[PDB]
Design a protein around this nucleic acid. Structure first.
Ligand SMILES: Nc1nc2cc[nH]c2c(=O)[nH]1
Lengths: 381, 324
RNA sequence: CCUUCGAUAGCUCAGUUGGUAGAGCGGAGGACUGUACCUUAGGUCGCUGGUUCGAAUCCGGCUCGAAGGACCA
């Protein structure tokens, strides 16, 4: 009976949406919450102060990406990832697996672990669950994740993946001696079917891991079966434990998943507006001198305009890419704040109707999955 | 002396407005390459209230220079009724009146007049070149006296002639007599001793009531030699070149290192000890080395901050040096 | 007044051994749903006239030029 990391004082009446607090060794995070990926944030050039200025609390990392370079031993020597990319808040490290890097760049999978490679030909290694939890102990993060077997993918391979995930969770629990310094999450697998998924959920609710996470969905995901799986998973789990979700970044996906009980969600040049995605490469409003959103409190709207960034977008590319990406992250943070504030005001059916009609015009033009899930949980549009 | 904040298309390279506010020592006057401001002239022609409010920096004064010194130009391509601008726009038939419309839309505080005669990159051909470079200033002064806000805008003169002694001397002598705000030295791209004593004589020939400018010279020792030879203002395209090749400047103002060597991946010290830039304040040199290995867009920003901070601190140091 | 050469995407040029057009810097459309970008448009190749199946490529001349002797200093 481990102490619960999640507390809740919020209960919707017409729906089962939730909003609460998570305690982590660098702060308290309000559920639901969005998490920018640290790899793309470092790729798109937003510094520490610009990302902290919007009010973010959780960033992201990968076991593979730091394991290849600058080396797990150098990171462990410097107590790396919190003093390295200089993230003052908490961070969640993804353990990695069969991501977009796959057998074209991966290697043979054996029982002890999965073999990882690199463009560096001498950098091929074997990522074992003990090896992965050793690396993630060297990273010194705030929420660690057990090593996953990602599927997109159906068949007995997913059953082997979920059974092997049970065994690897056993190996990960028996491996490291940090249940209190860091929190270990458990990836619920199951692919697109519910029976092996259901017995998998039962299996690690027998295990006393403090966190549960739905994985292996985004990439080939149909949203109706997506929300059905989210609903059955959130119904199965106890209400005092958080429910991480993978691969949810769009606004309607996020808010309707909040209506089902989720708490976690996680090339530049396109802004995010309350009416949707507004690609700022557009020459159709290259003469517009208004801000991107008159209500957005991001510095890009309040100091700059649309014509200026339209000019800056490719000329001095890095600065305008910075502007666009910080606007996107500010929009996502404000959307989460709006959803949580509306739920705490017990207005959430009215609020979902309101912004549904706002960024969709009318209830008739909305996608069927959002209306269907909101009607199932008990909200009429 | 003085420096110009080198801006590519409005803002500094790799720096946003908040990150420009992070930089210490940014001058109140910002250089604008006129080549990057071709379509910007149209946008400001139907924006009708200045470029400072347009880019989000109305509290700062502005300067428009035709030549981006990163891409200065060949041994000669300039004409004697037009100046091609290297960058993104303004090649064919840029008249003096086109420059008048451009400066009416931009409304700059200062602006550089046009030029010809890049052969320094004989006598009679240089006479023709200098006479045309006076024709430019005459046209600018004739078309500048009309509008009130343009009357609030200030002409900056251009000195030409080439490597020839007497022709550049008479260029200074016969270009000084016009009622102009300031002066520019052109055709001095690298450096020889010939251009050095040509500069020494020509800035001696000009009156001492006007500022002197130059183009294509930003490396610090040529900056010191042009300061002792008579130039007041300089561009700032050298730290952009330092950051573009992936290096970081190290010389103490009061040279450079390539981080792609493997010797710095263990050190916990910043690039410059005691540096007050953002990169030296929070990050370490090992991370800069690491992200230069993987080639992402963030170390360009951090290095670019560090190079601007170092380079404008060098200008602050040389302003305070001649002050004492 | 005379001798030689240049005028090409919005910008620098290649292409000039004649094949109507590419590269880069700049634009535009999409993907970003746990990261070791993709796709695409734009240029009457300064004007005038000529040769040629055909010009950016070659030229008389003009404009804007550049070098040099300069009809003038
Ligand atoms: N943690 C985690 N990340 C990803 C990224 C793609 N799929 C997955 C998954 O199943 N789990």
């Amino acid at each position: 009976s481990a102490p619960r990391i999640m507390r809740l004082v919020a209960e919707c009446s017409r729906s089962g949406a939730r909003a609460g607090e998570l305690r982590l060794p660098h702060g308290t995070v309000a559920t639901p919450v969005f998490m920018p990926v640290g790899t793309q944030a470092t790729m798109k050039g937003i510094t520490t102060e610009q990302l902290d200025s919007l009010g973010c609390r959780i960033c992201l990392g990968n076991t593979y990406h730091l394991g290849l370079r600058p080396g797990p031993e150098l990171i462990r020597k410097a107590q790396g990832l919190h003093g390295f990319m200089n993230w003052p808040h908490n961070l969640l490290t993804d353990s990695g697996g069969f991501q977009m890097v796959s057998l074209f760049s991966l290697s043979e999978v054996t029982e002890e672990g999965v073999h990882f490679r690199s463009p560096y030909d001498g950098e091929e290694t074997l990522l074992s669950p003990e090896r992965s939890v050793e690396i993630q102990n060297a990273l010194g993060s705030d929420i660690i994740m057990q090593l996953d077997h990602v599927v997109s993918v159906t068949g007995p391979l997913v059953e082997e993946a979920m059974h092997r995930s049970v065994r690897w969770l056993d190996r990960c629990i028996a491996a490291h001696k940090h249940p209190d310094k860091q929190n270990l999450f458990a990836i619920i697998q199951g692919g697109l079917n519910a029976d092996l998924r259901t017995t998998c959920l039962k299996e690690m609710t027998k295990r006393d891991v403090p966190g549960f996470a739905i994985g292996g969905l985004s990439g080939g995901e149909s949203k109706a079966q997506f929300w059905k799986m989210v609903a059955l998973s959130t119904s199965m789990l106890p209400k005092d434990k958080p429910r991480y979700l993978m691969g949810v970044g769009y606004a309607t996906d996020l808010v309707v998943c909040v209506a089902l009980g989720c708490d976690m969600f996680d090339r530049f040049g396109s802004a995010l507006v309350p009416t949707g995605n507004l690609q700022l490469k557009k020459k159709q409003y290259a003469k517009d001198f208004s801000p991107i959103n008159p209500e957005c409190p991001c510095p890009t709207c309040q100091t700059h305009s649309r014509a200026f960034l339209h000019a800056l977008l490719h000329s001095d590319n890095t600065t305008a890419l910075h502007h666009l990406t910080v606007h996107n992250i500010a929009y996502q943070l404000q959307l989460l704040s709006a959803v949580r504030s509306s739920i705490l005001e017990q207005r959430f059916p009215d609020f979902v109707r309101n912004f549904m009609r706002t960024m969709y015009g009318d209830h008739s033009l909305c996608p069927a999955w959002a209306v269907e899930a909101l009607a199932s949980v008990g909200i009429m549009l | 002396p003085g420096c110009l904040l080198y801006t590519r298309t409005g803002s500094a390279p790799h720096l946003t407005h908040q990150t420009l506010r992070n930089i210490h020592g940014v001058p109140g006057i910002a250089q604008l390459t006129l080549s990057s401001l071709a379509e910007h002239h149209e946008v400001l022609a139907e924006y009708k209230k200045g470029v400072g409010s347009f880019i989000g920096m109305p509290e700062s004064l502005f300067y428009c220079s035709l030549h981006d010194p990163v891409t200065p130009g060949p041994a000669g391509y300039v004409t004697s009724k037009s100046v091609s601008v290297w960058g993104f726009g303004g090649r064919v038939e840029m008249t003096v009146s086109k420059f008048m419309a451009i400066q009416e839309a931009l409304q700059p505080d200062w602006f550089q007049c046009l030029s010809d005669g890049e052969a320094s990159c004989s006598i009679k051909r240089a006479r023709k070149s200098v006479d045309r470079s006076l024709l430019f200033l005459d046209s600018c002064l004739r078309l500048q006296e009309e509008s009130e806000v343009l009357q609030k805008s200030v002409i900056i003169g251009v000195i030409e002639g080439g490597d020839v002694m007497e022709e550049r001397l008479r260029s200074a002598r016969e270009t000084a007599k016009r009622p102009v705000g300031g002066f520019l030295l052109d055709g001095f791209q690298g450096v020889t001793e010939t251009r050095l004593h040509l500069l020494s004589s020509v800035t001696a020939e000009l009156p001492e009531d006007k500022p002197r400018l130059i183009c294509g010279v930003s490396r610090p020792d040529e900056v010191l030699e042009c300061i002792e030879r008579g130039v007041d203002l300089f561009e700032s395209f050298f730290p952009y070149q330092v950051t573009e090749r992936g290096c970081a400047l190290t010389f103490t103002f009061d040279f450079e290192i390539n981080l792609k060597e493997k010797k710095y991946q263990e050190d916990f010290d910043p690039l410059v000890r005691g540096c007050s830039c953002y990169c030296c304040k929070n990050h370490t040199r090992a991370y800069i080395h690491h992200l230069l290995m993987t080639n992402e867009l963030l170390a360009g920003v951090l290095l670019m901050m560090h190079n601007f901070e170092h380079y404008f601190g060098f200008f602050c140091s040389i302003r305070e040096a001649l002050k004492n």
